[PDB]
């Protein structure tokens, strides 16, 4: 009868690359809400969130990868999951979300655009919100060692390693205060 749909179930239908193991774990603390995967790449994360409860907004560049999702999302009934090509490297947005995530998009971004980018997620994030960032440190953009930490000042810092994952990734989930 039921198959449930997890990680394991979209990468065996659709064979994309697995949902962020940090996306997975997450998901285990940050109740199903109103969430901004700003940088969906193909939608593995977004997928697997809107499968499971949240009210999934999936940006990215390339049309064709959107479109993908797009056809993906189609197939899989997920009326709560939205779809929309931007630049993030151009893009201000507005919007209250409960939950934002950026995962290994930021590298790719031009290093400027950074600033700006996280203070429009920090604001869009309801009090009491999350986001969740992973994120290369130190090929147009990569963290400093504690950079990460600095920009969510006064957030609560719920969890952050930064750790291997050849490249060192810093891994944040921060809540903001109510
Ligand atoms: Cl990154």
Request: charged share 25%.
């Amino acid at each position: 009868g039921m198959t449930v749909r997890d990680e394991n179930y979209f990468t065996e239908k659709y064979g994309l690359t697995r949902t962020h193991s940090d996306v997975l774990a997450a998901a285990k603390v940050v109740a199903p809400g109103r969430t901004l995967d700003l940088g969906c790449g193909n939608g593995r994360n977004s997928l697997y969130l809107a499968a499971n409860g949240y009210d999934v907004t999936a940006w990215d560049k390339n049309p064709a990868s959107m479109a993908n999702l797009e056809r993906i999302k189609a197939a899989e009934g997920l009326d709560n999951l939205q779809t929309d090509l931007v630049d993030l490297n151009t893009l201000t947005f507005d919007g209250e979300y409960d939950f934002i995530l950026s995962t290994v998009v930021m590298m790719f971004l031009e290093a400027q655009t950074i600033p700006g980018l996280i203070a429009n997620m920090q604001r869009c994030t309801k009090p009491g919100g999350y986001n969740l960032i992973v994120a290369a440190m130190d090929f147009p953009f990569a963290f400093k060692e504690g950079e990460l930490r600095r920009y969510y000042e006064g957030w609560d810092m719920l969890k952050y390693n930064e750790d291997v994952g050849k490249l060192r990734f810093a891994t944040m989930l921060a809540r903001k205060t109510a």
